[PDB]
Amino acid sequence: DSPDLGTLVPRGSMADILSKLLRLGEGRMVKRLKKVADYVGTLSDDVEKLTDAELRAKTDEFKRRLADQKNPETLDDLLPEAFAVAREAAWRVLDQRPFDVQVMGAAALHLGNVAEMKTGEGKTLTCVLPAYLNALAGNGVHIVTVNDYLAKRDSEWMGRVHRFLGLQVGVILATMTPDERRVAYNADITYGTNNEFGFDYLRDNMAHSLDDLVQRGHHYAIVDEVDSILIDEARTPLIISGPADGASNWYTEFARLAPLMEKDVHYEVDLRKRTVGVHEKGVEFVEDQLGIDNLYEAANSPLVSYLNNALKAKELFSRDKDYIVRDGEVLIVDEFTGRVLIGRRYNEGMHQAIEAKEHVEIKAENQTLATITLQNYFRLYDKLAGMTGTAQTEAAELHEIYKLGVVSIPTNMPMIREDQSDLIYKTEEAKYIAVVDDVAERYAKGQPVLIGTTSVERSEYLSRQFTKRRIPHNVLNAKYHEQEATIIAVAGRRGGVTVATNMAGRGTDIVLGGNVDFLTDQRLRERGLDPVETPEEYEAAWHSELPIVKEEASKEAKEVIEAGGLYVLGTERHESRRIDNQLRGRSGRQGDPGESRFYLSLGDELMRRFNGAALETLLTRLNLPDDVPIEAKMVTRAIKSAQTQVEQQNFEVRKNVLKYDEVMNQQRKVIYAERRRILEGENLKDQALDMVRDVITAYVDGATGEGYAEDWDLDALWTALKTLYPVGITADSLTLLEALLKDAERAYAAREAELEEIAGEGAMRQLERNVLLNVIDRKWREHLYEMDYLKEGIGLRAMAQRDPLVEYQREGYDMFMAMLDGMKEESVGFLFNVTV
Amino acid sequence: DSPDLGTLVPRGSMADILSKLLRLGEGRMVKRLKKVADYVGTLSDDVEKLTDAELRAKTDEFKRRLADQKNPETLDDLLPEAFAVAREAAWRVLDQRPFDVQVMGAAALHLGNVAEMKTGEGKTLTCVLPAYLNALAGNGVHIVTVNDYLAKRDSEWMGRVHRFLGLQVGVILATMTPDERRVAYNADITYGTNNEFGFDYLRDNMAHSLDDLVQRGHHYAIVDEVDSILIDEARTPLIISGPADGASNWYTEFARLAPLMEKDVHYEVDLRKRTVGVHEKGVEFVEDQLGIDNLYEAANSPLVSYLNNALKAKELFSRDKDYIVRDGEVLIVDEFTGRVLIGRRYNEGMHQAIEAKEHVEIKAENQTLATITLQNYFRLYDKLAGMTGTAQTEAAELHEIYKLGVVSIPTNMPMIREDQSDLIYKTEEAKYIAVVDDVAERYAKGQPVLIGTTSVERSEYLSRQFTKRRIPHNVLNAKYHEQEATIIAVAGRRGGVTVATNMAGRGTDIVLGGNVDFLTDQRLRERGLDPVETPEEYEAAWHSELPIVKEEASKEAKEVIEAGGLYVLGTERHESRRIDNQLRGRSGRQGDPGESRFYLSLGDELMRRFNGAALETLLTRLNLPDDVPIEAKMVTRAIKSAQTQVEQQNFEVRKNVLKYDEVMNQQRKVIYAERRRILEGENLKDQALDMVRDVITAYVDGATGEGYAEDWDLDALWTALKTLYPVGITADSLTLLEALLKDAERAYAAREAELEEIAGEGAMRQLERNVLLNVIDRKWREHLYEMDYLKEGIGLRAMAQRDPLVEYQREGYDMFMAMLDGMKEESVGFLFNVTV
Ligand SMILES: Nc1ncnc2c1ncn2[C@@H]1O[C@H](COP(=O)(O)OP(=O)(O)O)[C@@H](O)[C@H]1O
Ligand SMILES: Nc1ncnc2c1ncn2[C@@H]1O[C@H](COP(=O)(O)OP(=O)(O)O)[C@@H](O)[C@H]1O
Ligand SMILES: [Mg+2]
Ligand SMILES: [Mg+2]
């Protein structure tokens, strides 16, 4: 809630107004970013006149200035200086100085927006400035790319600038161990994919020791290719699944024991209150049958809950009345119509209790162990930003889900690509002869062509046609990234013909005459050089190799420009207009001439999903020859409309994935926070004592309600608490909650001192932490297994009278509260009686 | 507009009130209809004491009473008596007496409604009363059934009753010649299919001589199976198509000739007007090249138009500016977009002229020669009625399209069939072993089964199963109707197993024990007897052997009854709920016990067209086994919704077929009427002269236009007139509309006399008829070809900013008026100049 008169960088309250007018198309924000970039530009001389050592000393100066409480400075205060330094460093290291528009993009990233910068504007380097600046705070910065090849290349390439400025830079990769990740997350800047960041988030919240955590918070994430990651990939959650590792053998054991026990001798049934109470005689019976002294002595084995469930199974649920058994499944039926309520299961281990009671073999299964959606993962960061060539069409959603604004950064040079209209054909057969014809003409003239398809199979067909017309070309199937980048870096040379299935070679700019940085780096690699493993040698060869590559390139650029620039030829439409435009974008970077054009057909995958075949019937009936392009409003509408439906379907999937994830995101916050407390070694004595109180309170309550006299049930209450803790007073002594509470409170004091007797100095503090973590992990895993089934089956309730999401929340939250209550009372049980 | 107090048969004002309350479900109509049946019932003694002869004579009595201009009586007055006579007649002939409820249905038919009568209620018989009554009027009655086997069996079966009462009954069949047809249409009652009645209508309106007409008007049609014919079959029109009859060789000739002709020597071109005029020298040139004396001398060759078109083609239309040529197609392109205006051809034979000009092969083709939809066909009758077991679900459409009301006739015995709710399975596999088990159990109990499927290939798969299970059975594939009747007639016998694809065996009632009538007829025939070829002996055999047949059926019925009556097992749903119900209705006729049930799967054809796949892989994930019947308000909803959508789609196709047909139906009423005038011999001197008058006016109109002084093209006006007729006043006669018309009339009076010398009195009257019919048929055909193309392509020029149907009408009527104007111009041309 700040002011803004004569502040260069906009602060909070002004920054909002500026984000508002973004969505309204007014573009005042660009005027501002331009003012910032300009200013940074006037600091050029200051840094230009510095020594390499003196430029590197700037980092320590900034840190110093950010810790000064006598003379306070914020990252926002340091932005102009820190940018100027990074900009001059890049120039010295890479031999490329961030353009005025890169500095604009940079400031947008620092302010927490998506900078929309076209293909070829230099997003990779633009990134370095806000990354350097925010790294100074010492909390770490995550840069997200779309695959491992790219995270590795950026971290290694920009890492040179950061390491020069004295920062450490790490990557996380799929192949890396926990130890290796820990080091990478300890760097000042960490590159990686959404897969790696989120899975490490998920693993961390499963870890059984604080030493094993790999990440260190979610401070700032800059998402390269935001639309691919935050929109497209967000349709699908991150899931860790594994063996349910259930209590199958205890279920079986208690289904076996339940019959042997006798009604009203060993246990009581509250016919009315839906409840079973184990008697003194019965507790002994089970104790004897198991060779056991107390029902809570075995770690991770809640025998009380198993027993009670087996008895509830035996007495309160009737086969053919309440459920039936079909093919190894317990299936719940309704009242006295008795129809199979497909999907429903019983709760809190009751279902497994019944399965065992009906001698059903109990299913060894896989289950969810941890999840999060990309949306809720990235929502974790205190600051979020992103870069892409295409974001304005995703703006509303970026703003709703992520609170991310989108700024269109002006292009460095005037964009002059000619983007041609679709050529539409009645059949695939005809489209491809027209495509191959074009390619053949372009190739004769030397103009490099990029052909995009949408399946490997179609790319392979085109490959075969090119081969038969004798046009040499490569096919890139989005399979081997480093390999394919190698081909793409040279795709913009004369005679270039390159087929790219799906968006293959993403992230490697197709620079006319050859991508100069890609190739310099590549020559350096084959000579044994490495930005990280042999940095001095790498840098010194870079400075002499770059100028040579640029020449034998670049005069080649002159020839390609005359040939028309890069020709982009699309073969079908993608699931979105956006992705189509991404392909067009590969041509005409940095002000180059270029042309783009799609060739479509009524027999394309997309059109076949919809009305394409009807249309081709029609046109044949109208006598239009196959090789005549179609220009008709109705067919144009039909193509637009097929793609727009796929877009909308995808949007609704995303929206649904996120809706269902919110329910479980609330729940894991709580659970994950508890696990953290324990892993951190917090003193849990008070929480332990509160649970003890909480459980004894509910028991007393639950047997105390009305009548208000001796006319009550003290025998049920005493025996039930007896297994929970060593009750040390009589129902006789007092012929009440406060009484029972001091006894337990002092029985806990007794138990504590026992643990000093056994393992000494604060050993009760360690028993609490151990018991709770074990209890939370077992109970939460079990809940997850139950929640799997609930997601699935709820769909199967949908009507124009009930919203399925409401129902999933009510039942899913009920389940969660019941889980918490059970977590409490098993904890106090084990706390009192578990073997050490 | 008549009264109702004291009137037995409701008419005019009252009948309507009674139709309204029908769509409202009050059933005062049924109450009225039963009052009529009861009255007819009181007349039973009166007809019972009559001899056969006396009863045969009642017909001449009624006929004489219907004609009596002094003691007037209507069909309504005669209904009670004529019905009592027909009833008694059926009893004597058939040995079955119409039930009270059949008489009710009969009355509903006379009143022009659909009588909804359940399967097994005796619709074939019901029909005889209103058919008899209305046939008395002498105009013909058309009874429509669903195929040739049924039209022949009904005509020969009920034809016995009518023949007994002095009437002739005919059938039309697909095999019959026009002479045979004519005889059948001349009978008092005529049976046939919609195919035959409708195509006879199309041919009649193509006929070249009155001798050749087969039909004699559209007086009363009773449509048996109304829902099948007026709803279901109404989605597709009746088309007679054929070779376009090419003027192809003249097109080519004039394309060869146009080039040898010189601008401003042989012709002139008005560039501003899109017009061409052929000079004296040009007329003569063409004449000499064709060895002809006048371009109007050859009947059926409009040489003036061909020439004129060829000359427009040469001068006014430019290749690669107005049109391009592609795979020997002439395609129109716009001014300087140059893009193909797909769907567009040139008008009035200009297109062929262009094809010819470009030496494009003039493709031998097919076109519509005549059409009408079933809706417009049946709208021709003065009175319409119909019968079916299932019509109320179609009531709104019957009422709006045909003004038919729907009356549910109460059933003769209380219906007691048990329709079970559907059994839904995840996979076809599980459904089909589930089905085979039911059938096997039923077969073992002896209970007869009808198993409905929905494709030949599924019936065969089921057959192959049955065989492997050792269950003898028949597959009826809706292919050979008479053979399939033979089998179906005994399907309600013990051990009976009958698989019926689509609605196989439609029309043959599955009487428990055996359809006794069917069997009696069959037994008589396979000894050589025939209701028509051996009438006396057939009848003798019938009264003798029905009782034998009935006795041995019937004691067999009694067994089949013990076993639960007919079991109907549907295997999948049809394109409508109505049809599902037709299949169910085959069981439990006449008060019999019976059971129906469908077995469905998420894998069924119907479902695979929507979401079945998804539901199955869902259910699979919920671990629901395959043999458990799915009982979920979601899956029930899905199945209903899939069928409801196919239903709605059919309905939209039907409503579309008709709207587009309205336009062309109005055009053919006019053309058919014109053709009729000429076939009938009408004196057309007045119209001939009006045409002459019209054309000269039209020329004087165009040529005199505006400007008014000296500036007038008279030379060019005369030349255009000259080719039409021998103008006998030089334009210098006066130095104008009036004088021309008067000269034209004397030239015509001369012509009328020239014809006299060659043929004699009436010579010109016949020439007029011959010339007009030629001109009409030829331009109508051409127009039909052009409308074909118009309709195919109209959809292609559209939006949510224009209605295709409006533009179709606008363009279609425009072509039509231009066609008529063309007919007049050419007719006067031929009238003056044709060779005799
Ligand atoms: N300011 C700069 N001066 C010269 N070249 C630059 C500059 N910034 C980036 N480049 C080059 O432009 C090319 C595209 O860079 P990249 O960061 O991959 O762009 P993008 O991700 O925006 O499509 C790279 O070869 C890079 O070396
Ligand atoms: N009133 C009647 N008395 C006895 N049998 C009848 C009578 N009317 C019809 N039937 C018999 O009932 C059966 C069904 O006849 P049908 O005309 O095909 O009924 P629908 O067309 O109504 O399905 C036939 O075998 C027929 O001979
Ligand atoms: Mg990039
Ligand atoms: Mg019938």
Swiss-Prot record, chains A, B:
One function term, GO molecular function aspect: ATP binding
CDD domains cross-referenced by the UniProt entry: DEXDc_SecA, SF2_C_secA
Binding site residues for ATP: 102, 120-124, 509
Catalysed transformations (reactions): ATP + H2O + cellular proteinSide 1 = ADP + phosphate + cellular proteinSide 2
GO biological process, one term: intracellular protein transmembrane transport
Primary subcellular site in the record, as a coarse category: membrane
Localization, UniProt: Cell membrane; Cytoplasm
A GO cellular-component term linked to this record: cytosol
Cross-referenced Pfam families: P-loop_SecA, SecA_DEAD, SecA_PP_bind, SecA_SW
Its membrane topology: Peripheral membrane protein
Highest taxon of source: Bacteria
EC number(s) given by UniProt: 7.4.2.8
Signal peptide: none
Quaternary structure (record): Part of the essential Sec protein translocation apparatus which comprises SecA, SecYEG and auxiliary proteins SecDF. Other proteins may also be involved.
Primary role: Part of the Sec protein translocase complex. Interacts with the SecYEG preprotein conducting channel. Has a central role in coupling the hydrolysis of ATP to the transfer of proteins into and across the cell membrane, serving as an ATP-driven molecular motor driving the stepwise translocation of polypeptide chains across the membrane.
UniProt-listed HAMAP family: SecA (MF_01382)
Family statement drawn from the similarity comment of this UniProt entry: Belongs to the SecA family.
Name of the protein this chain belongs to: Protein translocase subunit SecA 1
Organism: Mycobacterium tuberculosis (strain CDC 1551 / Oshkosh)
Gene behind the chain: secA1
